[model samples]
Target chain A: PQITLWKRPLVTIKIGGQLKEALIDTGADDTVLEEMNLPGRWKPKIIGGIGGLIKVRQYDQIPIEICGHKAIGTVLIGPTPANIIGRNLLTQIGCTLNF
Target chain B: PQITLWKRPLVTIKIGGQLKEALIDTGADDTVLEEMNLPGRWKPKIIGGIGGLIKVRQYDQIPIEICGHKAIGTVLIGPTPANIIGRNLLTQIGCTLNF
Candidate 1:
C-alpha cells in the first residue's frame, strides 16, 4: 500500500489563468504558471543572474485562491509539465507538500 | 478509442543532465528541463528581453545522441513540467511531431 505522507485538495489554475486546484509544494520557491496556456505578449526579460538572465516573461498581478486561502501577486512565469504550487504562494496558507 | 496524432521515441535527459528516450513534438520550440533534479549551483542571470531583464542560469554545452544521430549545443534552461526537445535541437535531425 502506498503510505501517503501528505494528501490534500490542491488548487489547479486553468492554463488560461483561471484559479483551479493544485497541490502545494513546499520544495518549490516560485509560483509556476502553465507555459502552454500562457499569454504570448509576455516576453522574456533578460536579467543577469547566474545564467546571465535567460529569457523569461512577467505576468500581471493575479489573484489565486487555494485551500480556501487567497493571495494576490505578480507570479514568475515558466514552462512546466503541470501547474506548480510555489513556496511564495503556499506560505500564504501555511501549506506544504509531502510528495 | 482516441486516435493518435503523433508518436515517436523521445530523448529524455535526467534532471541531473543524463540523456534518455523522449518523444519529439513539432509544436514545441524549446528544450525543457525538469526543475526538481536540476543542480543547485546553477544560478539565475538577470537579462533584458521583450519582457525585461530576468534571472536565468547557464549550462555547459552537452552532447545528445538520439536514433543513431547526435547533436551538441548549449540549451537554454527553464522550469518545465517535463523535458522538451526545442526546435533548434529538433531541426538538427530534420524531425517534427504531428501532435
Candidate 2:
C-alpha cells in the first residue's frame, strides 16, 4: 500500500487488542504512542525531539499490526498529541519512503 | 527514488547554495533544520512534540532542493539533533509512504 503525503499519513494499527490510528513517520527513530495502558512491564526512558526531551515508558517486543501487517519491537508510551509509527517498527513491515 | 527504513533516510539537500543531509520525516507537520545561518529576516515561533516546545526562527518561502527536487515553503531553524524534511516539503516532491 502507498500513502500520499497530501495529508497526515495516518493508518489504523492494532496493539494489545486495541486499535488506534497513527502517523507513519519516517523522521522519528522510534515508535511513540500517546499515553496508554498496555499489559506488560516497561522501563522508564527519556527521548528527545524538536521540542526537547520527555519521560516515556518503553515496552519491549510488543506485537503490533500496522495496516494489517505485523511486527514486534519496542514501543514507547508518552505524552504526545498523536500516535507515531517510526522507522524501528516500519522496517519490520518493509516500509519505505518513495517518490 | 525509494528509501528503505533499514536506516535513517538521509539525503543530501541543497539550501542557500549549501548542501546538507536531512531526513524525510512524515511525522512532522513542518520542516525543521538544525542550527544554521540563513539570510533574511525571520519571525519567532515555538513548536511542540513528544518532549515539549522550543523557540525557532521561521523563514518563509525558502527555496530548498531535496534529493534534486525543488520546493519553496516556510522552514524552521531551531535546536534539534538532526535536520528534518517534514510533510510540508515532502508533499512538494510527491514523497509517499509505501510498504
Candidate 3:
C-alpha cells in the first residue's frame, strides 16, 4: 500500500485488543501512545522529541496490529496528543519512504 | 529513492543557499529548522509536538532544495534538535509511504 502526504498519515491500530487512531510518524524514534491499560509491568523511561523531554512507561514485546497488519515491538505509554507509529514498529511492517 | 527504517532518514537540504541536514518526517505538519539566519518577513507562530508546544517564526513560500529536489513551502525557524522536512515540503517532492 502507498500512502500520500496530502493529509496526516493516520490509521487505525489495535493494541491489547483495543482499537485506536495512530499516525505513521517517521520523525519519531519510538512508538509512543497515550494513557492505556495493559498487562505486565513497565519500566520508567524518558524520551526526547522536537517539543522536549517526557517520562513514559516502556513496555517491550508488545503486540500491535497496525492497519490490520500484525507486529510486535516496544511501545511507550505516556502523555501525547496522538498515538505514534514510529520507526521501531514501522520496520516490522516493512514500511519505507518512497519518492 | 526508497528510505528504510533501519536508520534515521537524514538527508541534505539546501535552504537559503546553505546546506543543512534534515529528517524527512511524515508526521510533522510543518517543516521546522534550527537557529539559522533567513531573510524576509515572518510571523510569530506556535506549534505542538511530542515534547510540547514551542514558539517559532513562520516564513511562507520559502524555496528549499530537498535532497536536490526543488520545493517551496512554509518553513518554521526555532529551537529544535534537528531540522525536519515535514509533509508540507514532502508533498511537493512527491514523497509517499510505501510498504
Candidate 4:
C-alpha cells in the first residue's frame, strides 16, 4: 500500500488493543506516543529533537499494529504533541521511502 | 529512487549550490538546515517539536535539488542538529511512503 505525504503522513495504528493515529516520522529514532495507558514497567529516558530534549517513558516489547501490520517493539509514552511511528516500528512493517 | 529506512533515511541534497546530507523527515512540517549563508531576506519564525520550540529564519522560494529532482520552497535556517528535508520539498520530488 502507498501512503501519501499529504499534510503529514498520518496512519491508523493499534497499540495495546487501543486504536490511535500516528505520524510516520523518519526523523524520530524511537516511537513516541502521547501519554497513554498501557500495562508495562517503563524506564525514564530523554530524547532530543529539533526543539530540544524531552523526558519519556520507554516501554519495551509492546505489540503494535500499523496499517494492519503487526510489530512488537519499544513504545515511548511522553508529552508528545502527536503519536509518532518511528524507524523501529517502520522497519518492522517494511516501510520504504519511494519517489 | 527508493529510499530504505535504514537507521535514518539520509539522502544527498543540493541547496544553494552546496551539497549536504539530510534526513527525509516526515515528522517535520518545514525543512530546516544548520545555519548557513543563503542569499535572501528571511522572516523570523518559531517551530515546536518533541523537545520544545526553536527560533528560525524562514527563507522562501529557494531552489533545492533532491536526488536529481528540482524543488523550490520555504527553507528554515536554524541551529538544527541535522539537515532536515521536510514534506514541503519531499512532495515536490514525488516522494511517498510505501510498504
Candidate 5:
C-alpha cells in the first residue's frame, strides 16, 4: 500500500476490538492514542513531544490491526489530539518512507 | 530512496545556507525549525498540537534541501524539540508512505 504525503496519512486501525483513526507519525517515538479502555494492566509513562511531556498508560502486547495487517505491541493511551501510529507498529507492518 | 521506520526518520536538510537534522513528520501540518536566522519577513502565527499551541514565525517560499532534493515552501521558526519537515516540504520532495 502507498500513501501520499499531500496530507497527514491517516488510516483506520482496530485496537482493543474498536475501530479508530490514527496518524502514521514517523516523527513520534511511541504510539500515542486518545484515552481509551483496554483489557490489560498498564504502567504509567510520560512522553515528550513538540509541545511537552504527556502522561500516558503503557499497555503491552496489545493487539492492533492496521489496514488489515495484524500486529501486537505497546500502545500509549493519553490526551493526544489524535491517535498516532508510531515506529513501534509501523515496522510491524513494514511501513517505510519512500521517495 | 527508502527510509526504514525502525527509528525516527531523521535526515539532513539544508535551509538558508545552514545544515540541520530534521525529522520527516507526516503528522505535523507545517514544517517547524528550531530558532534560526532566516533572510525574510515572517508573519506571526499560532499552531496547535497534542500538547498545546505554539507561536511561530511563518516564512513563505523558503528553499530547503532534504536529502539533496530541493523544495520550496513555508517554514515555521519556533522552539521545537527538534526540527521537523512536514507535508508541505515532504510533498515537494515526492516523499510518500509505503508498506
Candidate 6:
C-alpha cells in the first residue's frame, strides 16, 4: 500500500450553531479554537498545555459543522495561524491524499 | 512589573461529558487528545500533524470539566504522554503559580 501525504488548505465552515466559514488546515492533526476570537460569552476552566502546564479552560461540543459535515466533540482552544483537520475526522470523511 | 512563569502538575477532570481523570500538562501550548486510545465511539477526520502535515482527525468539543470545573472546548486529538492546558482560559481564571 502506497501512502501519500496531503498538505492542502480547505475552508472550515461551522454550521448548526454560531460558527461559519472557519478555515480548515490540513496540516494540523486535531481540531482547535482561536481563543482570542470567540463568538459568544463562554466561561471556561484553567488547564495545562504541552509547553509546560499552562492554565486554560474551554467549552465542549458547541454543535459545529465542518466541510458541510456536522459533528460534536472535544476541541482545544488557542490561537493558530490556521485551524486543523485531524485524522480522527478525516478518515470518516472519505479522504485520500496521494502525493 | 513582574511576570512569573508557572509550571505545575494539575489534575484535569472532564465533567458533563464522558471524560474523567485526565492529567493536566502545563508544558503543552494547546489541548490534545491521545489518539491512540479514545473512549467510546469516536469518528474522526484525518487531517495533519505539526511535525509535517500528517493525516489525522478529531472530535469537536465534548462536555468536560477540569479541577471540578465544567467546560466545553475543541481539543486536538493525537498520541501523547498526557493532555495539555493552553493559555486562553488561564488568563480568565484567577491563578498565580509562583515557582
Considering every candidate listed, which one attains the maximal TM-score? 3
lDDT (Cα, 0-100) at A66 in candidate 2: 96
True contacts kept of each: 0.00, 0.92, 0.84, 0.89, 0.84, 0.00
Which residue pairs overlap in candidate 3's backbone?
A52-B51
What residue runs in model 4 are displaced by over 4 Å at the alpha carbon?
none
- Cα lDDT tens digits, model 2, A1-99, are 989887888999999899999989888889999998886889999998666688899999999999899999999999877899989999999999898
Shift in Å, residue A16, candidate 4: 2.3
Better of 3 and 6 by lDDT: 3
User: Which regions of candidate 3 fall more than 4 Å away from where they truly are?
Assistant: none
What lDDT score belongs to each candidate, Candidate 1 first? 0.44, 0.90, 0.92, 0.89, 0.90, 0.41
- Counted clashes in each candidate structure: 52, 0, 1, 0, 0, 72
| Model 4 TM-score, all chains together | 0.97
- Comparing chain B with the reference, what is the TM-score for each candidate? 0.52, 0.95, 0.97, 0.95, 0.96, 0.50
The regions of model 1 sitting more than 4 angstroms off are A1-10, A13-21, A36-54, A96-99, B1-99
List interface RMSDs for the candidates, in order. Answer: 16.7, 1.1, 0.8, 1.0, 1.1, 19.6
Model 4 chain B: ten consecutive residues of lowest lDDT: B1-10
lDDT of 6 by residue, B18-70 (tens): 45444332223345555544444455544322222323345455445566555
The Cα RMSD of model 2 versus the native structure comes to 1.3
Determine the iRMS, in angstroms, of model 1: 16.7
Give lDDT tens digits, candidate 3, residues A1-99: 899999999999999768999999998899999888977889999998877988889999999999888999899998888999999999999999998
- Per-residue error for B67 in candidate 6, Å, reads 45
What DockQ would you assign to candidate 2?
0.83
> TM-scores of the models, in the given order?
0.35, 0.95, 0.97, 0.97, 0.96, 0.33
For A26-65, candidate 1 gives per-residue lDDT tens digits of 3334556556444435545442221233454666556676
Q: Write the per-residue lDDT of candidate 3 for residues B1-99, one digit (tens) a residue.
A: 999987899999999999999999998999999989887899999998777888999999899999899999899999988999999999999999988
TM-score: model 5 vs. ground truth: 0.96
Decoy 6 TM-score against native: 0.33
lDDT of 4 by residue, A6-98 (tens): 589889999866889999988888999998788868899989997888788999999999999999999998988889999999999998889
